[PDB]
Write a protein that binds this ligand. Structure first.
Ligand SMILES: Cc1cn(C)nc1Nc1cc2cc(-c3cncn3C)nc(N)c2cn1
Lengths: 288, 280
């Protein structure tokens, strides 16, 4: 809960860059930004607005914000430390997969791990705001963890030259997009649940719906088009039902994380331990 | 083609990150000349989008108000890296200029000089059927000789950028589903840039970009906060920001406008800017 110097607490090794905790040598992921005196001041107020939530196995534990005072004359550097995850992102997992599609049991496993960590954030009144394949990471083992660099006050999005940027729209729920009949872009906890159904499609198809559009045409269509659907008809009735449960157009009628955690596609995973093995086996092969 | 590109090894050096593709302050080894080097990691599928920007630069960068292209190189890697080499504008951008000024604003004669140069570079592109599509204070730069140069053609895609300089017709809504572009959308961004010079920040700066994106098509054309400006300047802003693009003036018609055309201190304004850069 303080913007301090990284000296002695954390050190970098060489946008996210690898680092280490100097005291135990424990690995770290350090997000690096460039801030002005005004942006460094804005981070101080936003750190006071941070909510308190405990450690979690499905969330890459947020350590803190530091200001690496350097260089004199140029812009200073803001560092955001978080738990280190080795096997990369779900996006990387799908890219480095045979048909750029995952097994339905792998998707069910990863979606439950996403929902588990989401449920953690939602009881502590925190919205993730950016659930997508690129922000779900895999540790050395088959552990599934949500990216967290101070998501309670969005410390990685409020400052820097890319803060004013609208961003990538493909995983945005209808309510977060301002349009005619939606003039106030309402981020709700249920917005992460739409993003989870879009992430599930990304696991099944390699890319989220509407990926073939220019980002501005996709942004216009997400609030107007009926809910996205899986292109293939191979998938089970449980998968279609889960996607249909997440991708409710009106968030007021979309279920909570708790209800989705009791959905048969997420709830009924008999091969849970076998799927957790072939995931770690995939990680092992990729390391070569 | 990209296969005929040489490694930049004894040709150019990446000195210090100047902008953002990530733009470095680059130096030619043989002479010591300063150049801007845009470094972008070529994914073997993007060898078409990256190529389009290089073609535009080779084709139209020679003009007085466009930063001149020097050459391109590929540094191999066991995802290769493309080096887009072009002119080095020493002063920085108009955004940096305004913010590094007392009361974060610019003088009306400076605003008229820079505005004519943006319109000059835009006229060249529009003549040759090219819409820049990203006119703003960040993409208008100055050389050490206090000259004006347009940069960044990596728009003319996965993340939508900043909304503030977008003309209403580029933002789709029920009445405009296809977001019907035209070269006159650059003339709206020029007007937003003249307001950004005159007030430090663009017309909806204190809003969330998604609320600004919703509001730009629905609000009447922005206006200056201060009454101090001349009737010439307000009329110029009104010309750039004609809400419906069908009745917005051309780049040629905007060059003839009294705030652009009637410039008496043309050779003298350049001198006050040349003195401001000197500050170190
Ligand atoms: C001294 C200085 C300080 N800043 C912030 N920039 C400076 N110099 C500079 C930057 C350039 C950047 C680009 C460019 C290409 N694609 C996107 N961009 C932004 N193109 C050029 N031709 C440039 C020429 N000179």
């Amino acid at each position: 809960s303080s913007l301090r110097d990284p000296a002695g607490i954390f050190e970098l090794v060489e946008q996210v860059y690898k680092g280490r905790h100097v005291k135990t040598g424990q690995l770290a992921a350090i997000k690096v930004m460039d801030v002005t005196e005004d942006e460094e001041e804005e981070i101080k107020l936003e750190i006071n607005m941070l909510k308190k939530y405990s450690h979690h196995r499905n969330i890459a534990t947020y350590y803190g914000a530091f200001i690496k005072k350097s260089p004199p004359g140029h812009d200073d550097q803001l560092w955001l430390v978080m738990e280190f995850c080795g096997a990369g992102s779900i996006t990387d997992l799908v890219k480095n997969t045979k048909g750029n599609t995952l097994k339905e049991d792998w998707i069910a496993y990863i979606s439950r791990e996403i929902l588990r960590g989401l449920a953690h954030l939602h009881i502590h009144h925190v919205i993730h705001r950016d659930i997508k394949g690129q922000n779900v990471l895999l540790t050395e083992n088959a552990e599934v963890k949500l990216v967290d660099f101070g998501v309670s006050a969005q410390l990685d999005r409020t400052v820097g030259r890319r803060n004013t940027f609208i961003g990538t729209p493909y995983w945005m729920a209808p309510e977060v997009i301002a349009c005619d009949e939606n003039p106030d872009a309402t981020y709700d906890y249920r917005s992460d649940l739409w993003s989870c159904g879009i992430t599930a499609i990304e696991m099944a198809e390699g890319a989220p719906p509407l990926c073939d559009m220019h980002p501005m045409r996709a942004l216009f269509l997400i609030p107007r088009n009926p809910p996205p659907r899986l292109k293939s008809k191979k998938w089970s009735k449980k998968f279609f039902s889960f996607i249909e449960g997440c991708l409710v157009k009106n968030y007021m009628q979309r279920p909570s994380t708790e209800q989705l955690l009791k959905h048969p596609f997420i709830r009924d995973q008999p091969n849970e331990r076998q799927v957790r093995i072939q995931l770690k086996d995939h990680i092992d092969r990729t390391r070569k």
